[PDB]
């Protein structure tokens, strides 16, 4: 067998909630492996949560997070558990279970935990428009998809006709608990007053469809 | 407690040798710190490279070396390949806990460096009616990911009101695109006039600045 660490854990929880992530091992004698939990925040780098011995005799935690997380393991089930209690907004991250072999050897696929007290809200779509570039330089326009919850949002241009040069960025979870995203497209500035560009935003969780037209400020 | 520090970024060519360092605020990095080196490739792909300062994870190529250089722990990629282009986190053990570093964006040149096209977008009037203003800065199709974006409002460097997002590396031409969003209240937006985005990137001789003045064309 090949080593596989399969995580199973919740996704969305509200501030003050609790969650328990699991990491089931198959392909190693789990009973003779040190285990560890790490996490990757959206902006921050890796952050070490903790580690636990094969017999669970010694459990080490990062000093900053000793009271929020509880590490445990069941070697009979070949499973590692992480309990997060009374979470906060900054706990939004990808949580990974690692198995030590001279180092951070075997990893799980990671489980996303999103902490936000937000309710389902449809996005507000705003135009990202240029003055008309008077040098003829290539021009860029777009849409700002702001203040929505939950995550999945689809943006297309001209009902899918416009595909080349489009860059739809990943959403960023704002401090307010809401996501914000921007879709951008580059076109020749010559065809800025002549051609129409429309961004089609679809937020299925709130049943919102928005077709916004982007044109340079009239001046 | 302690702060673990490593280079922000490094750029090298295929076949060359690069060396990343890892610094401890408590003093010199000794072997009792059991330095670990972990790599994150695009799409959040984590791989263990080095542990216990010198010990490779079984299966890792020998071009990855763990050493101690003076005061610091060191990861040496000898004869780097394009697949080694990733973010390298260092970790130091302080008796009962690990502390990770900020990470080092190592770059192995897949293609000639490409400078971003920088664009600035002022807030819309539709949005202004709602009481907030978002100024957006777009860096387009630049190769080495590392880029610094500073917001200047009337020559005053802004901090805390900006959030960045960046696309996945294109498979064809290995390029990236970046959007920095500066969010601030309508009062603050109508209080100042000159809004500038200063981009610094390896493909540029001097940092480039794109600006607009509120109310003007």
């Amino acid at each position: 067998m090949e080593v596989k660490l399969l995580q199973s854990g919740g996704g969305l929880v509200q501030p003050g909630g609790s969650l328990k992530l699991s990491c089931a091992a198959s392909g190693i004698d789990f009973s003779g492996y040190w285990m560890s939990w790490v996490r990757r925040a959206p902006g921050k780098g890796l952050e070490w949560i903790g580690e636990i011995t094969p017999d669970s005799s010694t459990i080490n935690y990062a000093p900053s997070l000793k009271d929020e997380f509880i590490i445990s393991r069941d070697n009979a089930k070949n499973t590692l558990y992480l309990q997060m209690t009374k979470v906060r907004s900054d706990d939004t991250a990808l949580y990974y279970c690692v198995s030590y072999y001279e180092g951070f050897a075997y990893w799980g696929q990671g489980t996303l935990v999103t902490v936000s007290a937000a309710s389902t809200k449809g996005p507000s779509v705003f135009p990202l428009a240029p003055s008309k570039s008077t040098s003829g330089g290539t021009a860029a326009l777009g849409c700002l998809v702001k203040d929505y919850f939950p995550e999945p949002v689809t943006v297309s241009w001209n009902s899918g006709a416009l595909t080349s040069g489009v860059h739809t960025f990943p959403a960023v979870l704002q401090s307010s608990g809401l996501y914000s995203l921007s879709s951008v497209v580059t076109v020749p500035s010559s065809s800025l007053g002549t051609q129409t560009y429309i961004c089609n935003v679809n937020h299925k969780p709130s049943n919102t469809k928005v077709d916004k037209k982007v044109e340079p400020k009239s001046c | 407690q302690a702060v673990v520090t490593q280079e922000s970024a490094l750029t090298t060519s295929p076949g060359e040798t690069v060396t990343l360092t890892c610094r401890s605020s408590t003093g010199a990095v000794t072997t009792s710190n059991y330095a670990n080196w972990v790599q994150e490739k695009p799409d959040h792909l984590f791989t263990g490279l080095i542990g216990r300062t010198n010990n490779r994870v079984p299966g890792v190529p020998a071009r990855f070396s763990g050493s101690l250089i003076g005061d610091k722990a060191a990861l040496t990629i000898t004869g780097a390949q394009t697949e080694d282009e990733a973010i390298y986190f260092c970790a130091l053990w302080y008796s009962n806990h690990f502390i990770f570093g900020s990470g080092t964006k190592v770059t192995v040149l897949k293609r000639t460096v490409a400078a971003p096209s920088v664009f600035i977008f002022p807030p819309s009037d539709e949005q202004l009616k709602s009481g907030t203003a978002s100024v957006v800065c777009l860096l387009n199709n630049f190769y080495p990911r590392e880029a610094k974006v500073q917001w200047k409002v009337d020559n005053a460097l802004q901090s805390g009101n900006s959030q960045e997002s960046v696309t996945e590396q294109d498979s064809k031409d290995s390029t990236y695109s970046l959007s920095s969003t500066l969010t601030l209240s309508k009062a603050d937006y109508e209080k100042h006039k000159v809004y500038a985005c200063e981009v610094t990137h390896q493909g540029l001789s001097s940092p480039v600045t794109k600006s607009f003045n509120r109310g003007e064309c």
Binding site: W34, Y100 | W93
Partner: peptide
């Protein structure tokens, strides 16, 4: 007989 951890 355990697997080597990342520290000692």
């Amino acid at each position: 007989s355990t697997a080597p951890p990342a520290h000692g």
